[PDB]
């Protein structure tokens, strides 16, 4: 029920594993250090 974007503080990776569970299909994981990350986000924003 989030109005603002959910930024999650997760050491021990409980949050991460649960988002992969809840959002099973087409949850495309993108480290900020990914090389073409701007392209992968802007394509997922448009239809993802």
């Amino acid at each position: 029920a989030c109005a603002r974007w959910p930024l999650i503080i997760d050491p021990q990776l409980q949050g991460s594993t649960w988002i992969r569970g809840k959002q099973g299909e087409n949850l495309t994981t993108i480290s900020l250090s990914q090389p073409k990350w701007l392209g992968a986000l802007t394509s997922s924003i448009s239809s993802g």
Binding site: A1, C2, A3, R4, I9
Partner: protein
Amino acid sequence: NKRWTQNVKFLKENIKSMIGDSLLASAFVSYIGAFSAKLRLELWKNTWL
């Protein structure tokens, strides 16, 4: 009739009571989330409710 009047009267009390709820819910979703178990509990149960 008796079981649909009871569902009405309860739902009418369930509008006004889901107006005072939503305040707590909203207050809780917006801010609480950065805090730890003990403190989170002290904000909505010891101060707000």
